[PDB]
Amino acid sequence: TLQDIGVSAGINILSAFVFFIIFAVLRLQPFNDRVYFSKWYLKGLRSSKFLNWMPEALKMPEPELIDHAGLDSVVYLRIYWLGLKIFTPIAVLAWAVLVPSMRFWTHIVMAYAFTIWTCYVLMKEYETIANMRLQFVASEARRPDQFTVLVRNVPPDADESVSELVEHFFLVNHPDHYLTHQVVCNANKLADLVKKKKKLQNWLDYYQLKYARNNSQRIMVKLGFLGLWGQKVDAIEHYIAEIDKISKEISKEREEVVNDPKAIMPAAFVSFKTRWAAAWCAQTQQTRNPTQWLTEWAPEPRDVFWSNLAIPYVSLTVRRLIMHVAFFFLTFFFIVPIAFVQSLATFMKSVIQGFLPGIALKLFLAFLPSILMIMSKFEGFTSISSLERRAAFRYYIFNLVNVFLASVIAGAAFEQLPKTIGVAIPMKATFFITYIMVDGWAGVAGEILMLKPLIMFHLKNAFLVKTDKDREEAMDPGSIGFNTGEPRIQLYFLLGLVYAPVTPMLLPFILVFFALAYIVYRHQIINVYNQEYESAAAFWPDVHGRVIAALVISQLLLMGLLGTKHAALAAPFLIALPVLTIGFHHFCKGRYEPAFIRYPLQEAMMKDTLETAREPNLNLKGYLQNAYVHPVFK
């Protein structure tokens, strides 16, 4: 309750302030600059009154920040500014209209204005992001992707190899445009192998340094309880035998994979002389039969998820269905722990009653993004970007169904002791506020520390590093974590929209979270979070659709909420909201999303002509030949 609300808020804010103190203290430490400044290091800019950095983050203006970091990161940062802009006027206007009858039409017009302002700011920022994407891609440098494309589902032929097939096909179809062809290799088991070799070499290095320190004994083979099947106290010879065997294993794998007809799938990489050729051919249904020669734009060379490549195309739909069903069952299963958590939300002892449930919830939700990651790993998308897309989608679905609906249902049920659900709904605001403060303020004030990378790096250096220059690749700070970033704020958007016309005080905490997250993530993206891939901000439409769905769901649940005073005779105003919303969405889509999903062919003319004018004498063929060949054995 209110007292517990204040106590939990205080404990969270003090924890966050202590987190800032720790961040500053370790920040000034001189022997860990390698970590908290991964950037300026992968960019090669550095080598070797107590909160001053706070505004220091805000400089380095937006075009400059784009140059420093990258577009998609800028958009992700922009998300928070979007949200704060959306909810500030809504917050103040509602807060003014807190009359604690006329309230019915009051909330009705309040929600109408809320939605109209929301869609207005949405479309405005949508156009702005469209323009900045256009400018960014226009000013973009050359990458091998923009003149090649992925192709899939080529009909098989017993006599002619796939190379001859594709050569004949594209010479007939697009003469004077074809450049080269690359055949996919189905040796992912060798990739698992080379990962194993890396891990074993890492182990052997550890035991080598340890034995150099002093002679020791080891009997725990990665399990302790199920350790070595004996003593094997020395075990260096064990790894020597292992590396010998695996060396002959990889040598063999080479000598058959260089001659395996089975290593080829009905898919390949083809490159064209001009971007326009790529668009015209691979962007459009290429043949008369739409069931073969299936093509879409190629991923970045470092985006190629080679493991997924070995999935037969016929089986992916079956995989999709099986995975969708398994997803529904997993959401079913994880209802019960959440129900436990909410039931925990039932005198100075009640401080833990208000506090713990959010923490516990977060702990049972810590794993789930990883499960969704693997889940998409079994999915077929072949590009870590698209994996991020789908994973975020799944996380949204799970959070919406469980953390919101299941929680409110459980709260109402445990409160009940048919005409009571309406008065039940708003009361869960306290629970949601607590969950927000916890999984937000504290969580961000912690993840600013990068405890896990920091500890990993320090243990690596003190206990595992053998020479120098190996620190440099040792930093793997990880990307922004889109699968975790986008959906959390998406959920907050949903909650704000739903509870705004019923419960105002949810909003200011949301504003606090938005501000702190904006500034902290800005600092991070300035100094850490090297981006593993750089898409053309292609994810934005998904966010737009998600927020639209959020708004319409908020409207519909509000309509349900006004079922308290039965038949207020204003329902047909709540009926117009969804149709207007969906019409707005469809119009926005058909009017602007081509600028994202399609690549402007006129812009292709401009870019290719400018490239030709600035350099008509580039041997681009050899530059593009060896791309998309192989991760390890190029």
What does R_g of the chain's alpha carbons equal in angstroms?
Answer: 28
Question: In angstroms, what is the resolution?
Answer: 4.5
Alpha-carbon gap, residue 145 to 149, rounded angstroms: 7
Alpha-carbon gap, residue 278 to 284, rounded angstroms: 9
Alpha-carbon gap, residue 55 to 135, rounded angstroms: 28
Q: Among candidates 405, 444, 401, 395, which has minimal Cα distance to 425?
A: 405
DSSP-assigned states of every residue in 335-357: HHHHHHHHHH---TTHHHHHHHH
| Contact by Cβ (8 Å): 433, 356 | no
Report DSSP state, residue 304.
Answer: B
Which residues have C-beta within 8 Å of that of residue 419, sequence separation ≥ 6? none
C-alpha 193 chain-centroid distance: 28
Domain ranges for the chain, please list them.
2-7+59-140+313-450+469-622, 188-257
H or E segment to which residue 562 belongs: none
Which residue bears the tokens 């070995």?
310
Q: Among candidates 335, 328, 269, 329, which has minimal Cα distance to 303?
A: 269
Which residue bears the tokens 């800028």?
74
Task: State the method.
Answer: cryo-EM
Angle (CA) 608 613 617, round 5°: 95
Distances (CA, A) of 610 to 136, 439, 558, 603, 606: 16, 49, 54, 10, 6
Cα torsion angle, 557, 573, 501, 439, sign: positive
DSSP-assigned states of every residue in 463-476: II--SSSHHHHH--
| Contact by Cβ (8 Å): 604, 281 | no
Alpha-carbon gap, residue 392 to 398, rounded angstroms: 10
Token code pair at residue 64: 């400059």
Q: H helices within 97-183, ranges in order?
A: 102-138, 162-173
Distances (CA, A) of 120 to 52, 547, 611: 36, 13, 39
Alpha-carbon gap, residue 270 to 282, rounded angstroms: 10
Q: List b or e across 590-602, with b for residues whose CB sees 16 or more CB atoms inside 10 angstroms.
A: eebbebbeebbee
| Contact by Cβ (8 Å): 300, 143 | yes
Q: Among candidates 375, 489, 400, which has minimal Cα distance to 80?
A: 489
H or E segment to which residue 569 belongs: none
Report DSSP state, residue 383.
Answer: B
Alpha-carbon gap, residue 311 to 315, rounded angstroms: 7
DSSP-assigned states of every residue in 180-202: EEEE----HHHHHHHHHHHHHHH
Token code pair at residue 362: 């977060």
Residue 213 CB-half CA count within 13 A: 12
| Contact by Cβ (8 Å): 618, 288 | no
Alpha-carbon gap, residue 548 to 570, rounded angstroms: 23
Cα torsion angle, 137, 140, 146, 150, sign: negative
Alpha-carbon gap, residue 314 to 317, rounded angstroms: 7
Q: List b or e across 253-271, with b for residues whose CB sees 16 or more CB atoms inside 10 angstroms.
A: beeebeeeeebbbbbbbbb
List phi, psi (to 5°) of 112. -55, -50
What is the SS3 assignment for 178?
strand
Which residues have C-beta within 8 Å of that of residue 316, sequence separation ≥ 6? 380
Distances (CA, A) of 609 to 596, 612, 615, 620: 22, 5, 10, 15
Q: List b or e across 7-28, with b for residues whose CB sees 16 or more CB atoms inside 10 angstroms.
A: bbbebbeebbeebbeebeeebe
Residue 230 CB-half CA count within 13 A: 5
Alpha-carbon gap, residue 339 to 344, rounded angstroms: 9
Alpha-carbon gap, residue 9 to 434, rounded angstroms: 8
What is the SS3 assignment for 531?
coil
Report DSSP state, residue 295.
Answer: E
Alpha-carbon gap, residue 153 to 184, rounded angstroms: 12
| Contact by Cβ (8 Å): 327, 406 | no
Alpha-carbon gap, residue 267 to 162, rounded angstroms: 8
Q: List b or e across 103-117, with b for residues whose CB sees 16 or more CB atoms inside 10 angstroms.
A: eeeebbebbbebbeb
Alpha-carbon gap, residue 268 to 182, rounded angstroms: 6
Which residue bears the tokens 């992968």?
42
Angle (CA) 229 233 238, round 5°: 70
Alpha-carbon gap, residue 13 to 512, rounded angstroms: 11
H or E segment to which residue 400 belongs: none
Which residues have C-beta within 8 Å of that of residue 546, sequence separation ≥ 6? 396, 490
Which residues have C-beta within 8 Å of that of residue 634, sequence separation ≥ 6? 626
Alpha-carbon gap, residue 324 to 319, rounded angstroms: 8
What is the SS3 assignment for 448?
coil
Cα torsion angle, 349, 354, 357, 362, sign: negative
Alpha-carbon gap, residue 206 to 201, rounded angstroms: 9
Q: Residue 425: how many CB atoms within 10 A of its CB?
A: 21
Alpha-carbon gap, residue 499 to 505, rounded angstroms: 9
Alpha-carbon gap, residue 484 to 84, rounded angstroms: 19
Q: How many helices (H) and strands (E) does the chain have?
A: 29, 4
Distances (CA, A) of 353 to 79, 393, 427, 492, 576: 33, 32, 15, 23, 42
Residue type at position 490: Q
Which residues have C-beta within 8 Å of that of residue 454, sequence separation ≥ 6? 26, 32, 35
Token code pair at residue 241: 């035998």
The order of strands in the sheet holding 267-272 is 178-183, 267-272, 148-152, 294-297
